[PDB]
Amino acid sequence: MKRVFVFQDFKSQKFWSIDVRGTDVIVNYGKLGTDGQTQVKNFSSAGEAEKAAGKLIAEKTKKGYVETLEEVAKEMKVEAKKYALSYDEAEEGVNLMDKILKDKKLPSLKQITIGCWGYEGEDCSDIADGIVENKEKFAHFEGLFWGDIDFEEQEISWIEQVDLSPVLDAMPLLNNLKIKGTNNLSIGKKPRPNLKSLEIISGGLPDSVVEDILGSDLPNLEKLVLYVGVEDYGFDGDMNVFRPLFSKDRFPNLKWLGIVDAEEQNVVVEMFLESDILPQLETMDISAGVLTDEGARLLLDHVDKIKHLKFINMKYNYLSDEMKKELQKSLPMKIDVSDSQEYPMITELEH
Amino acid sequence: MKRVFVFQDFKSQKFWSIDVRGTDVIVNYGKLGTDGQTQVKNFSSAGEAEKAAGKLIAEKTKKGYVETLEEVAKEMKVEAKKYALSYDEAEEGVNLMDKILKDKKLPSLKQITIGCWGYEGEDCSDIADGIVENKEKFAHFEGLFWGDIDFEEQEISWIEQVDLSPVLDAMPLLNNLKIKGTNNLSIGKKPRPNLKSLEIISGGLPDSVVEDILGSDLPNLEKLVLYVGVEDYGFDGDMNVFRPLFSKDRFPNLKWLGIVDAEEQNVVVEMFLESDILPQLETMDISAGVLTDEGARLLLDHVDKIKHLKFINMKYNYLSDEMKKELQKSLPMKIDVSDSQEYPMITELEH
């Protein structure tokens, strides 16, 4: 019997189905709303086929694929899209906001990603203004990924943002907010009970951004991930600014907290351990930074405070293999200590 | 004074220029033939500006950018391109070979990349046949990257190749050959003094492919990189097949040799050390595989045989930090021991 699975985020809107018939395992995959492709693999026996199918399924669900009724998946449509201006379109005089405002599938999308907006060094004012002036067309969005600009297009430290508080105000249904680039960025100081997830990717996170968060009310927030970055590109050097964020009173529903990509990553470990928010968390995110053995050490010296966590993300670190072995054996929950670097030590986005 | 630099390979055709005026460092970058973008960065003094510019330049040249006269770079055009069929084009009934044969810039390109050719599980027969039947239009190419199919499109083990010997025969000026995917692949057994570089990326490299190489004459070959892959996806399990390749008589002009992405990566180290080809090599490539400390050990026990090399690539390995430190301090030349994994151990393409 065919089992259908679906994966959906800002970038992927696809399905994957598997069926075992005899000694053949039949896979069908593609973008939602299309027939997709088909792969058939023969096995020595029905037993090997079923065993193979089992591993594929387990792998897919581990990656986030959700089993879905075939009749439902069949009728599902792409509900996420990225709008970006190419260099050619710019030369042609194409206006990104016009590409967005024009799209007839715009009403059907639940998530939207804003990518490169120009090549003349302009900030994203036209985009912010355009959205604010057309709130009715964007009032329905539930997810926004603002600034999906790759390294090749322009380094993160060159992304020119604007005050996005008016844009967020025009999207009252947003529950997932992701922003990349922090130069001149702001999100205001307003209550935003609509937000469930907030992640800001930065090459150096200004204090103004943190203050906007501290000044905002996010009672229903469940995930908060902030890239610290370095002083050369925006960070002001004072790590104590993040401390007030570690408060259950401030984020009573927070499950995932992350202060990442910092030179002083070990300090973040201390913040977690001494915070009153830690008991409620499921995930401690201390990735992308210069997390050393003295940082991991703290965790091991306080297993009591963290043994309830479901995941500790330390992806990209400077741990020694001996420490990683210890962490592996001494910590009961899932942890990611991958991408260890060779122990000047720099943050992940500094590469 | 503005200094202009250019980088060109199968995927990138771009320029980068830098100029220091006062305390400002002015960078201009983009695709060859376009005005590109401009970034200006102010510094505290002319000294800091020049120092900053120096680091940017050093970084660019280290990445392969070649300083070029401004008047020359200004007139340079993109000379590499990738032709690929999207799912939409297929639905529209578009034929990839027609997209290629149609392009009016085809005569001006020096390098060509063949990407996805269909979505019905077809092999690349139309492409091979199409080229063979239009040798005059492709007789000028100097570089060919056949099979640039990403993981998301379809896994490497699902790429369906064909006998490409006729395609290579239709491109007598080719000097750089790169092929990804090896199912039913062949390149024939003919003399090909035109080839300078040959790299085959595979999830399991069949003996038929190696035999084609052994059966061919490549006197002017300077680089040979072969991905071994695993038995589950094509490799036949016998590593001794590669041994005859390690011969100065066979490849008298070889400078870079690589047998990579193998489960028995340590054995490859032995092949190098015992070969008569090693003395002439500049680069020993033993990356992407399960290279362990006992493998690196051999190198350290025989510094005499390798101290002449300019580079030993061990990117993606299973070395311990202690061994990497030793290698770092005991080996006089540049080495890449990055992307170490945590010591079932698998090959890079097995992920």
Tokens (6 digits) for A135? 């709130």
Q: Looking at the partner chain, which of B39, B119, B321 has a beta carbon nearest the beta carbon of A158?
A: B39
Strand duo B24-31 + B13-21: pairing = antiparallel
3-state secondary structure of B336: strand
DSSP per-residue letters across A304-335: HHHTT-SEEE--SBB--HHHHHHHHHH--SEE
Q: Residue A70 and residue B318: Cα distance in Å, rounded?
A: 42
DSSP per-residue letters across B153-215: T--GGG-B--B-HHHHHT-TT--EEEEE--BT-B--S-B-TT-SEEEEE-SB--HHHHHHHHH
Q: Residue B122 and residue B95: Cα distance in Å, rounded?
A: 12
**Backbone phi, then psi, for B62, in 5-degree steps?**
-70, -25
Q: Could you tell me the resolution of this structure in angstroms?
A: 2.0
Q: Does A343 touch chain B (CB under 8 A)?
A: yes
Q: Does B86 touch chain A (CB under 8 A)?
A: no
Instruction: Specify whether the CB–CB gap between A138 and A177 falls below 8 A.
Output: no
DSSP per-residue letters across A263-295: TTHHHHHHHHHH-SSGGG-SEEE--SS--BHHH
Q: Which residue, among A137, A125, A138, A220, has the nearest Cα to A171 in the 3D structure?
A: A138
Contact A342 B338 (CB under 8 A): yes
Reported in sequence order, the residue ranges of B24-157 that DSSP labels E, i.e. its strands, are 24-31, 37-42, 66-67, 80-83, 111-114, 143-146
Contact A343 B337 (CB under 8 A): no
Q: Which residues contact B60 (CB under 8 A, 6 or more apart)?
A: B5, B7, B16
Q: Does A337 touch chain B (CB under 8 A)?
A: yes
Chain B residues whose CB is inside 8 A of the A31 CB are 87
Partners of A259 in beta bridges = A226
3-state secondary structure of B333: coil
Q: Residue B106 and residue B351: Cα distance in Å, rounded?
A: 36
3-state secondary structure of B39: strand
Q: Does A88 touch chain B (CB under 8 A)?
A: no
Q: How far is CA A130 from the centre of its chain?
A: 25
Q: Does A30 touch chain B (CB under 8 A)?
A: yes
DSSP per-residue letters across B99-123: HHHH-TTGGG-SEEEE----SSS--
From the number of C-beta atoms within 10 Å of its C-beta (0-12, 13-18, 19+), residue A92 rates as exposed
Q: Looking at the partner chain, which of B38, B119, B321 has a beta carbon nearest the beta carbon of A121?
A: B38
Q: Residue A70 and residue A18: Cα distance in Å, rounded?
A: 11
Q: Looking at the partner chain, which of A119, A320, A337 has a beta carbon nearest the beta carbon of B37?
A: A119
Instruction: Specify whether the CB–CB gap between A168 and A143 falls below 8 A.
Output: no
Q: For chain A, how far is it from start to end, CA to CA, in angstroms? A: 47
DSSP per-residue letters across A198-213: EEEE-SB--HHHHHHH
Residue B184, CA atoms < 13 Å, CB-side half-sphere: 10
Q: Which residue, among B254, B156, B244, B169, has the nearest Cα to B200 in the 3D structure?
A: B156
Residue ranges and CATH numbers for the domains of chain A are 2-75 (2.20.140.10), 77-351 (3.80.10.10)
Alpha carbon of B270: minimum distance to chain A alpha carbons (Å): 26
Q: Does B324 touch chain A (CB under 8 A)?
A: yes
Alpha carbon of B343: minimum distance to chain A alpha carbons (Å): 9
Q: Does A119 touch chain B (CB under 8 A)?
A: yes
In terms of DSSP H, where are the helices of A103-254? 125-132, 135-138, 165-169, 207-215
Chain A residues whose CB is inside 8 A of the B343 CB are 321
Q: Looking at the partner chain, which of A87, A158, A321 has a beta carbon nearest the beta carbon of B320?
A: A321
Q: Within 10 A of A240 (CB to CB), how many other CB atoms are there?
A: 8
From the number of C-beta atoms within 10 Å of its C-beta (0-12, 13-18, 19+), residue B117 rates as buried
Q: Residue A306 and residue A292: Cα distance in Å, rounded?
A: 18
3-state secondary structure of B71: helix
Q: Within 10 A of A338 (CB to CB), how many other CB atoms are there?
A: 14
Instruction: Specify whether the CB–CB gap between A181 and A202 falls below 8 A.
Output: yes
Cα R_g (chain B), whole angstroms: 22
Strand duo B223-227 + B197-201: pairing = parallel
Q: Residue B272 and residue B268: Cα distance in Å, rounded?
A: 6
Contact B37 A121 (CB under 8 A): yes
- Sign of the torsion angle spanned by Cα atoms B208, B198, B32, B141: negative
Q: Residue B73 and residue A343: Cα distance in Å, rounded?
A: 40
- Sign of the torsion angle spanned by Cα atoms B51, B55, B61, B67: negative
Q: Residue B28 and residue B39: Cα distance in Å, rounded?
A: 6
Tokens (6 digits) for B3? 């200094």
Q: How far is CA B85 from CA A235, A328, B154, in A?
A: 44, 45, 13
3-state secondary structure of A140: coil
Q: Which residues contact A303 (CB under 8 A, 6 or more apart)?
A: A330, A331, A332
Q: Does A86 touch chain B (CB under 8 A)?
A: no
Q: Does A324 touch chain B (CB under 8 A)?
A: yes
Dihedral angle at the C-alpha atoms of A53, A57, A59, A60, nearest 10 degrees? 140
Chain B residues whose CB is inside 8 A of the A120 CB are 37
**Backbone phi, then psi, for B111, in 5-degree steps?**
-130, 145
Instruction: Specify whether the CB–CB gap between B164 and B128 falls below 8 A.
Output: yes
Chain A residues whose CB is inside 8 A of the B340 CB are 340, 342
Instruction: Specify whether the CB–CB gap between B300 and B318 falls below 8 A.
Output: no
Q: Does B240 touch chain A (CB under 8 A)?
A: no
3-state secondary structure of B267: helix
The C-alpha angle A275, A281, A328, rounded to 5 degrees, equals 95
A154-160 contacts at long range (C-beta below 8 A, 24 or more positions apart): A154/A116, A154/B37, A154/B39, A155/A203, A156/A180, A156/A181, A156/A201, A156/A202, A156/A203, A156/A233, A156/A349, A157/A183, A157/A203, A157/A204, A157/A233, A157/A234, A158/A183, A158/B39, A159/A183, A160/A121, A160/A122, A160/A123, A160/A124, A160/A184
Contact B321 A324 (CB under 8 A): no
Instruction: Write down how long chain B is.
Output: 351
DSSP state, residue B241: G
Q: Which residues contact B301 (CB under 8 A, 6 or more apart)?
A: none
3-state secondary structure of B78: coil
Cα R_g (chain A), whole angstroms: 22
Determination technique for this PDB entry? X-ray
Q: Which residues contact B50 (CB under 8 A, 6 or more apart)?
A: B20
Tokens (6 digits) for A349? 């986005």
